[model samples]
Target chain A: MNTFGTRLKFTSFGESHGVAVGCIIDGMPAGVKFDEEFLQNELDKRKGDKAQVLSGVFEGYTTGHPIAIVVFSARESVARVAGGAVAAMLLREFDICVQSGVFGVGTFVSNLKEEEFDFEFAKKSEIFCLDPKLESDFKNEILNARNSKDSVGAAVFTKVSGMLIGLGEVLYDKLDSKLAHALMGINAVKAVEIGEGINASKMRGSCNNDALKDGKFLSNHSGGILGGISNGENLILKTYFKPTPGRHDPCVGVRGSVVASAMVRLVLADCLLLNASANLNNLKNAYG
Target chain B: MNTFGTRLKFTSFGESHGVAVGCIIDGMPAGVKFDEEFLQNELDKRKGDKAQVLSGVFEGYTTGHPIAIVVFSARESVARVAGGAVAAMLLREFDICVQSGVFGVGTFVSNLKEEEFDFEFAKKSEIFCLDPKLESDFKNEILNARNSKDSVGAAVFTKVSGMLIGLGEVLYDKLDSKLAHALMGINAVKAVEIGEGINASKMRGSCNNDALKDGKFLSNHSGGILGGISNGENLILKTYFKPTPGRHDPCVGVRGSVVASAMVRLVLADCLLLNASANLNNLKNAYG
Candidate 1:
């Protein structure tokens, strides 16, 4: 259950209060540059933590095998370990930007509109909120919940851009379904919505259907997916996390967004590699 | 894309019209009885065809490795080339019965009723209808479609009995979600329903929820799955197949049912092995 992805899979081991936590990422393609600093930076987003690369890289590039990374966290929880390092590192080579922001912290939902989301700015924000206007409100909500010795739920908004046209397996492993699986797999995550999601279920077919114009769709109500395949649009996903039971951190959503982004990157990378052999032309183009 | 399952994975190769069509089943557990006659019988259900076991079985038992099966058919499509031999063979040892029947053929739907479903009788009935009374009506409907030089859509009903509890991975790889992926991946399959399925979505929470009493459920509305794990009830699934385009056989659902049953068995077997490591007690019980 700790393992994820198909072509690019990562299996994590160790317990929350165990000796150490680590992940072994298998099936990564060879020849991608390895940026140790970038990988550490991604890990630092989850914790101000550090990780050691045990294997699978040489001469500043991947060796086309399983890449193992271990994080020795004695005081920190396993969730704070460097879980997303391999995915973030691999996706960096493709220039696939997987950006996520805290959209809601309890009742204090973000007033920032979709067009106003600044992923770069969200990274520097105290609570990882895309909108600076509501960042203070989110922090206050978290503080108030902590003061009451209670926890609050949260929502994360993730958008994947710079994706290829055909990066999904149809029928069973649709891109959206896979994303839903990955997001829901995260701890405390209860609901996941892609683009219109539940809202679309209530809409008429005529109104909900994305109309294609020229080379692009007029709207993205389908959330960049059509019949289980990526439709060359910005993939949008919203994940909702329930409040952790007992005495738990109220700002788990902040780290949850980072995990969500990493899962998206991993899924897209797996799909990209899986789709490599989908067509004869692609195979000939790559090999020949 | 041709690969399926996780723990007991199978990757298929060859083409619809090629030298030979076959499959390589990986991750099968060790020491299970391998019955060649039964495997051939399972394949015979589809085409009345024969298959060759290439490797992985030794001394009439599995050897904990990949099992490869090849079928040579010059005139037949790859779909009919013994796709389910390996799964059917392995599941035979576990005594997990996956029986499927053609529930709807064009406008003629079976009136067999749920209580009257006899999986044993279904195997003998033509068109795979569970009810002997409506077998002739289903055959007539298929003939009507074929006589008109057209094809019609069909529905298949599959039921899985003698299942073990806790045979699913939560969040991403729930048993029902995996089933949806496997069934949807089949050719011409348009929709898949588990138990009440779409109907449960429309019902209120109180009406849809299954009540438990004395280690058994009052009803099986959730189709033997809750939160992606088996609840030890008979699993029920309905698959809808769209009419194949151009000039095609109208009785595709008959073979489709057989394929669906094979897939369910494979999933259950895979889940069983995956669940082996889910709890420490189970691991200790197996090892110690």
Candidate 2:
């Protein structure tokens, strides 16, 4: 169910413990020399099967405006992969970030480079971090849950250095509709959005929809995907994951027979970052 | 906060009430003679404050392919008129149903004309109101709740007579993006979706994306949108709403302020269908 496409297209595949849980994004800008390494860096954020719950794999590739990216899990457990068990698994997310960040592939996003964003309307974003990691302390916590039936969960954060504005819709799936389908399709994601994302609930039109001036939008409230398309600015997004449902948690079968707890531990799965690969490449499809 | 754009071309204002909730679509195929009554029938689904909570102020207007529809609340409450109340607002979500139901906005999709289908691979569905009084019953519920100090919810189930199979990705929202923006501008919404929308989560990749053959999509699981654009089929969509916040009963607020209950009196919003004039013309706008 992860393979999704829009005017911008992306396809995600791989078994839980399969070689990868990555995406193939078709439609990235033709001239954009994608930086695969930069993309892998983002996936690093969920290193170690951060989410024991779900799984998949990835790497990045291309096809016209559409490109492909995949996230490969070290094993069947996202809990271990995201914790650095599989560095490759963590890298897939970055491929998705660059599209939002407006940085070249293989480039680094960090504080020093962030200085390059000196212009006012520059990619008004922080440097894109090619490498993402969680502290060792966080890794230790995973050891305790290794045997639990609880499905693992993960978090993702991204920032791009430079970006242009004027993309996206107001309500529902807008003209930038392709972006909406691309994002929603890539991950078994529960939600996707820009800086403020759904926070706009408390916001006002004056605060939500960025005002346009000089052919550029002044704010990033819409996540740089204004109507449903990329606004050419730093596309910042956060996605949430549900606990894997593979656990053998006791549930009444159709006839109410108790089944072995083969659900969670027995379910074949992979790392959490894999779902993002296809999503990343799809972002570039617009520019292509 | 309810607003969601496609590729950034659709502007739908999401609202429970605004002077009117309309779409300012910008991207549409040129020279399409839009059907006005067909559109009115669609708007009637949620227009006016029916005996039910539905808000009605039919002002569906179109200059061309891109359309903007706003439902006004003549009896808009003071808080509504000032703070604004247009009723349940949203975009037509045309992309979702464009491929699944009968063509031309049939009130009962089950009665779709097979020959009217431009795509033979089209899907068909039908529903019958088991209760003859169901429509009137709903109407009464809406009217009684008008001044109840409670909020209302809404949804639009679009039916598509026919469409192409698996167009995958096409440019959507170039103009419709504006219309979606208009709907998102409304703040009362909780969720919105096109076609089976997230329902695809239940399907496998084999079943999720529709197969195209003989000029038609094999499955409607993808709805009518792929990668964020339309496939020339009818866009069908449904929206969800949270209960009204202002209640005659006390409730909690993020600020921890004691809020009194406030309910709105019901208005025959749907009855306003006769006045729909805005969407009758060819509503079209283009940015490039």
Candidate 3:
């Protein structure tokens, strides 16, 4: 339960308000360039802290083994967020980019479409909102919830670009299903929707079908997936978080989006390795 | 992709029509009762064949390590069915019984309700049908399909009784989700339903919700699960299979049901071990 992913797994432990929280990442391929600065920067997106690498990476490169990462907390921790950063360090080698934006805080859903999402712009936004026009409004909603000693739910929109085709396993190890499992595992997350998730059920097949033309899908109603496998399109997902039960930070979604993106990266990274051994040609190309 | 569990895992290899299909079960707790006769009998349910245990069990008990089981075929294999039988041998120590029956074959659906299922009767039925009355009809359907040089889809209903409470992990590793993952992984399986499944989505909350009384759920509408964890009731699931593309054995569902039960046992066994370490009290009880 504490661990996530199959190949690129991270087993997290320690209480949130305890001594410290950490992770042990197993199954990372060897020979990846280790970027401590990038790893720290990614953690900084969630918290201003430094992570200590206990093992796995040696001489600025992965040793094809389990990579242990830990972040000390003052009666606190950083395993969840650090996992994404560590995965990103490994995934960057493949030119894959995993990004997320605060799509909705309570009733204020972003009007911005998928292509409109600017990962860099979202990182600069105070609340991680993709739409600058709605940034203030999103911040105000959180403020209003916090000031009133109440909390509101939020939603995160995540996308994976430069994803390789055949990255997901069929049936059980599906990309969408695995992503849902990872996202829903986060605290306060209640629902996860893939592209046209709930809406697709309500629409006619003619309207929901993603037409293909010239080796490309014209539309992405299936959220870049067809029957559990990636079709070389941008993978998109929406994660819904329930309002925190207690009086807590009103901006949970801001950091939550970052965690969501991290989870996506971990899943994609795991899928990539899994897909590598799926076919005879792939094995020949990889091992021969 | 070949492995099918978290803590208690079985990695299968070899093609069904190739040299041999076998499995290596990892993470079985040490000192479980290993009944070789029972194991052979279980395999007999699917095929009148023999399984060779190359490792893990020693002196008639598991040695707390990986158990390698291989069933040599005449240019063939038995990994999937072997996995369930192996799990059954281990789970028998905990008094958990995983059973399955032919629920539907093409248009011939069994009218027997959940309570009416007789595992003993099903095991004896030619088509593994729970309802003796429908057994003939089910056989006729399969025979007709084969006679016409065609194939028809099928559905298998599986159940687990005597399951321990607090076995499933939340969010991603929920009992229902993992079961879905396992069942869907089987060849020709396309859909999996838990409790009311898709029907619950179509109904209002009032109609779909399982009422609680005296700490027991009045109805099994949620299929013995709430929030992805088993609620101490019999776990039930239905797996749907599509017709094979080529002319093959008309009784795939007959053996498919056995595989479904095996997968459920594997998941439950994995969950049982994972849950043992979930809480401080549990760890204290076990280790101290």
- lDDT per model, in order? 0.69, 0.29, 0.71
- Once fitted onto the true fold, the runs of candidate 3 whose alpha carbons sit more than 4 angstroms away are A7-165, A169-270, A273-288, B15-17, B73-77, B213-215
Per-residue lDDT for A120-200 in model 3, tens only? 878787667887777787788778877876666677889888877787886458776677667655554545556764343
Model 2: residue A76 alpha-carbon error in angstroms: 12
lDDT of 2 at A114: 27
Worst 10 residues of 2 chain A by lDDT: A254-263
What order do candidates take by TM-score, descending? 3, 1, 2
Instruction: Write candidate 2's Cα lDDT for B184-270 as tens digits.
Output: 223333233444443332222333445667886665543355543446555444322222332331111111100000000001111
- Identify the runs in model 1 with alpha carbons over 4 angstroms from their true place: A7-165, A169-288, B15-17, B73-83, B110-118, B131-134
**Candidate 3 lDDT:** 0.71
Fraction of native contacts under 8 Å reproduced by each candidate? 0.05, 0.03, 0.05
lDDT of 1 by residue, B1-288 (tens): 556677777677755557667777889877878878877777677743357878888999888778887876133233323535566666566667778987776666665655457677788876788767677877887777677765656778889878778888864587876776666555545456667643442233334457876778887777777767889888888776555332456557677788887777777878877887878997898898
Q: List the residue pairs that clash in candidate 1.
A: none
The clash count for each model shown is: 0, 230, 1
How close to the true structure is residue A104 of candidate 2, measured as C-alpha lDDT? 17
Give the per-residue lDDT digits (tens) of candidate 2, residues A1-288. 233223333333456556555444433333333344433443342221112212222223222342333444223122122222222222233332222221111111122232232323222223222222222222232232234433222222334324433333223323233332233332222223345543333333333445677886676555545433446666554332222223231111100000000010011011111122335575576356
Choose 1 or 2, whichever is better by DockQ.
1
Off by more than 4 A, model 2? A1-144, A147-149, A166-177, A186-188, A205-219, A229-233, A246-288, B1-42, B45-288
